């Protein structure tokens, strides 16, 4: 058919990106906002985080495909910077644009970049200082990594709970939290909130006065497939070989229910000795009223509807083995939660599996009556969880609020890449994308992304001072004192995911449809 070539294909590329990018620039720091997102489903989503906006919907361009790619990098590889990663490239693109606006090769200006990124990486090592993984040292990173991602006040209460979650570790040291994430969204009088609740929490537990709400000594038979069949890890018919056989099973189906409670009432006394130790069958389907009562009446807690995750985290948490049957099991495999506690909050029971024998799994209780509030608060958590988890995995920490970038753009002082000056321009180009965080904020916040940053620049050129645009009012300060300190996992990776995709479009002279 047709194609596009020369700078015509290039113009479509570089324009579509920076046409999409500044749309995303509306949000960063706390002075960013929460961008309304409605995908084909019709749900409104408000996110200052990149991955949501990037991976849901896009104004469709050939560039819109690569942007989520390196967006699939930042959140994956780090989780802090998804908001920050986008704003870097087009600021660098408009720079390089100038050089090819002058006219030049996108190839020679390509070679003018990555060294500067490699430089800044060096410079990032240089300017940063390794910092404590201490809880309160994390806070200044925690708020910021959250706050660069999501708005302050949410990030502020998240600063507490996220650190409380990432400090909950057994010293399983990760960039993210897999197990520390157990999210319980609850309809509540609090529309945006997250409650930290330790230990594995079960999707539900069953009510009955004889059924113990408090199990401190738990022998947990994980229970999935219901009372209604004998020794069955899956519910299926023992009958229905003809038309009238349909009636016979349900006539004999109530038998297995009593057979099954018979197993559990004895398996308690088998394993637990007397009934003082609550024998825990968490029945991940509904417990039939008779055995619901008769397990209650025997002291067994028959818990209604845990999760497959609450089955696997149980295998983790309780240090015991799960099962898909209620069958009598050897007392060994039965899980032990140092606390099995059914917790009715609102009308809903959330059964704590606590004293996790592997407390890498904790639980967050999310709050809202309105899902649009309840979704958004859930969203701000986890992108900041792994962000602040990049705080406590990192003994190195990089000070935020433009402290380190003026330590690059100025210390990139040119003719160090003197050869063609294309690097001297490319590093200059790269130097100019560094300050987008000092830019976007003094942009979003008061004064000017420029007239404040000149102080930042100046005040950094002053006394080598760590200095930066406020995340809040957009005025100069000392960013080291403020404590705004970016994850050491962000900075390096934040650079890589930029210049690698910033390299591609330059070498792309061609597009065809």
């Amino acid at each position: 058919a047709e194609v596009a070539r020369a700078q015509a294909a290039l113009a479509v590329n570089i324009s579509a990106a920076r046409g999409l990018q500044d749309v995303l620039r509306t949000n960063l720091g706390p002075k960013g906002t929460m961008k309304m997102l409605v995908s084909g489903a019709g749900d409104i989503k408000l996110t200052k985080d990149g991955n949501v906006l990037l991976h849901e919907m896009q104004i469709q361009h050939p560039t819109a495909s690569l942007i989520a790619k390196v967006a699939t990098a930042q959140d994956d590889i780090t989780g802090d910077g998804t908001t920050s990663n986008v704003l870097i490239i087009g600021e660098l693109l408009k720079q390089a644009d100038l050089y090819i606006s002058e006219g030049l090769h996108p190839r020679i200006i390509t070679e003018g970049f990555e060294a500067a990124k490699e430089k800044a990486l060096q410079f990032l090592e240089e300017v940063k200082v390794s910092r404590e993984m201490d809880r309160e040292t994390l806070i200044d990173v925690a708020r910021t990594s959250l706050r660069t991602k999501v708005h302050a006040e949410l990030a502020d209460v998240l600063t507490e709970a996220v650190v409380d979650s990432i400090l909950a570790i057994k010293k399983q040291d990760e960039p993210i939290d897999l197990f520390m994430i157990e999210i319980m969204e609850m309809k509540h009088k609090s529309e945006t909130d997250t409650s930290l609740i330790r230990g594995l929490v079960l999707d539900h537990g069953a009510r009955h006065p004889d059924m113990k709400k408090r199990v401190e000594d738990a022998y947990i038979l994980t229970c999935n497939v219901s009372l209604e069949y004998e020794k069955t890890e899956v519910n299926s018919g023992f009958f229905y070989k003809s038309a009238e056989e349909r009636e016979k099973l349900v006539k004999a189906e109530r038998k297995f229910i009593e057979d099954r409670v018979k197993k559990i009432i004895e398996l308690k006394r088998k394993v637990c000795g007397d009934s003082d130790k609550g024998f825990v069958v968490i029945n991940q389907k509904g417990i039939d009223p008779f055995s619901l009562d008769a397990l209650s009446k025997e002291g067994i807690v028959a818990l209604r509807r845990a999760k497959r995750r609450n089955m696997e985290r149980l295998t983790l948490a309780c240090g015991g083995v799960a099962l898909n049957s209620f069958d009598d099991l050897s007392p060994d495999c039965l899980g032990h939660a140092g606390l099995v506690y059914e917790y009715t909050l609102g009308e809903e029971k959330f059964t704590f599996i606590e004293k996790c024998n592997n407390p890498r799994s904790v639980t967050l209780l999310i709050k809202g009556p309105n899902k649009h509030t309840l979704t958004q608060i859930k969203d701000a958590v986890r992108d900041g969880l792994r962000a602040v988890k990049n705080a406590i995995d990192d003994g190195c920490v990089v000070p935020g609020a433009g402290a380190v970038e003026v330590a690059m753009a100025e210390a990139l002082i040119k003719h160090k890449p003197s050869v063609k000056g294309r690097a001297q321009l490319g590093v200059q180009a790269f130097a100019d994308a560094l300050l987008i965080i000092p830019k976007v904020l003094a942009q979003n916040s008061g004064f000017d992304l420029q007239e404040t940053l000149v102080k930042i620049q100046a005040e950094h050129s002053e006394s080598g001072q760590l200095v930066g645009v406020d995340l809040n009012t957009g005025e100069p300060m000392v960013a080291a004192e403020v404590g705004v300190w970016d994850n050491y996992c962000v900075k390096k990776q934040l650079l890589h995911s930029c210049t690698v995709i910033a390299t591609n479009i330059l070498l792309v002279d061609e597009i065809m449809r």
């Binding site: 706390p30 002075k31 906002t33 979003n444 916040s445």
Partner: protein, 103 residues
């Protein structure tokens, strides 16, 4: 206006926010007297009258007295109050003020 004046998003939002925090602080201060009875129809009716005022153009006192009766007298206390303490059989005939509270 502050958009025409040029004030940013969170800025003025922080304006109403810390002020609605400031306002929620004053709301208990601006409580003017009080009243209630876990039983009495008439006294309770007046609040139930005046709350449904916005929500009713019709008889203010009559639906005041019914729902006050209803809400109260369905209960041994009405120190406790719940979602459905009152349901309705919508029935025509006679008057609209012929309406009666039957627990």
């Amino acid at each position: 206006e502050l958009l025409r004046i040029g004030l940013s998003v969170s800025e003025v939002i922080e304006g109403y926010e810390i002020a609605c925090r400031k306002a929620h602080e004053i709301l208990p201060n601006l409580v003017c007297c009080s009243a209630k009875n876990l039983r009495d129809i008439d006294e309770v009716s007046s609040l139930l009258r005046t709350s449904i005022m916005s929500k009713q153009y019709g008889n203010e006192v009559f639906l005041a007295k019914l729902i006050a009766q209803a809400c109260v007298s369905i209960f041994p206390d009405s120190g406790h109050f719940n979602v459905d303490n009152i349901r309705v059989c919508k029935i025509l005939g006679s008057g609209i003020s012929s309406s009666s509270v039957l627990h």
